[PDB]
Ligand SMILES: COc1ccccc1CC(=O)N1CC[C@H](C(N)=O)C1
């Protein structure tokens with residue numbers, strides 16, 4: 001689990017969104033596994049606006065923050081799970097690192113701020129849903 005709180009927005013994995021998030025929906029995309037809902041309080045996270053390919057992510061299944069090199073956002077085949085059938089997920093970045101299903105929501109960050117959240121993994125890989133192209137997260 002986990003979320004990004006920027007301005008009056010909450011960014012979560014679409015598959016983990018709550019009733020309140022769907023009721024206060026701003027934008028969602030099943031193909032990206034992302035959902036953004038509105039909040040009443042101001043968040044404190046800053047979204048990175050960059051092309052960084054190195055960063056640090058939080059892995060809840062190890063209580064550890066791991067430095068990683070990750071690929072640029074791309075369309076990647078993702079195996080079937082309890083939440084989606086096997087499909088291509090877009091804007092996904094992969095890295096070699098540990099992840100378990102409940103690690104989704106862990107933040108990946110670089111020197112410029114939040115890059116994305118854990119969204120996929122298995123077999124020694126970890127995949128992150130990119131948020132850096134969502135420019136509107138920084139305004140209104
Ligand atoms: C971090 O993900 C994993 C880690 C180890 C094993 C399996 C997984 C994948 C997983 O369970 N899901 C849920 C839905 C999500 C998606 N974005 O399609 C992927």
Ligand SMILES: [Zn+2]
Nearest residue numbers: 050052110112
């Ligand atoms: Zn960066």
